[PDB]
Amino acid sequence: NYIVPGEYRVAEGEIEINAGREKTTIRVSNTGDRPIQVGSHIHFVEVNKELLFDRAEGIGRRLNIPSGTAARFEPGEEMEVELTELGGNREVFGISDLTNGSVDNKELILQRAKELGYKGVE
């Protein structure tokens, strides 16, 4: 009972993020020569062209990491990441303009990916 002004006593336990959403692990490769860092809430299939991974597995998903954190890929680096399912309406607009609608248009998102040259459109 030394007083730290404004201090927290946090209750016991752990917080599970993105609970009850399906999760998926995939390998991803920074085939570029510059570092790439990916935010918690970008639609995974829409990330930097030069990331090689199976683009299909990115669709309707984002990184299963704490909100507001990011995964880093140094140039040349390959590593596994875990994904979770997008929620709400499961629609994506803007970003890279690959979806602009329901994440269910798998066939369309992937076609746009292939034509613009996102690596890993399988």
Whole-number minimum distance, CB 107 to another protein, in Å?
A: 20
Q: State yes or no: residue 79 binds another protein (CB under 8 A).
A: no
Nearer to another protein, 42 or 56 (CB): 42
User: Which one, of 31, 4, 17, 107, lies nearest residue 69 by Cα?
Assistant: 17
Query: By CB under 8 A, what part of segment 81-120 binds another protein?
Result: 82, 84, 86-97, 100
Residue 65 binds another protein, judged by CB under 8 A: yes
- Tokens encoding 47: 């990330």
The torsion defined by the Cα of 66, 70, 71 and 75, in degrees rounded to 10, comes to: 180
CA-based nearest residue to 87, from 61, 56, 58, 57 = 61
Interface with another protein (CB under 8 A) = 2-19, 32-43, 46-50, 62, 64-70, 72, 74-75, 82, 84, 86-97, 100
